């Protein structure tokens, strides 16, 4: 009876790294470059950071 080899596993306690809370920090730097008031560029830098 050397059981705990089963042990009906241990498909595990699963503190695994499957996280996004770990938050998905959507730093949306919407750089609206206007000239005179007209939009010339919108450099929308989505830094899509997973903390």
């Amino acid at each position: 009876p050397n059981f705990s080899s089963l042990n009906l596993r241990e498909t595990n306690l699963d503190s695994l790294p499957l996280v996004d809370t770990h938050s998905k920090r959507t730093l949306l730097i919407k750089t609206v470059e206007t000239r005179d008031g007209q939009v010339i560029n919108e450099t929308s830098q989505h830094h899509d950071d997973l903390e």
Binding site: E33, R35, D36, Q38, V39, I40, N41, E42, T43
Partner: protein, 52 residues
């Protein structure tokens, strides 16, 4: 004829200023519009990199 040329000379000078009004706003526009074609070629190349 001389009243019509004293008039055409004062007209030439007035109407050169009344075109200098339009063509100075088009000249400011043209210089800003060379700057805008760089802003819209920045939009083409930036948003076409983002299309890729």
């Amino acid at each position: 004829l001389r009243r019509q040329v004293d008039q055409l000379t004062n007209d030439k000078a007035r109407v050169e200023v009344e075109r200098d009004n339009l063509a100075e706003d088009i000249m400011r526009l043209r210089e800003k519009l060379q700057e805008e074609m760089l802003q819209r070629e920045e939009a083409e190349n930036t948003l076409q990199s983002f299309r890729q």
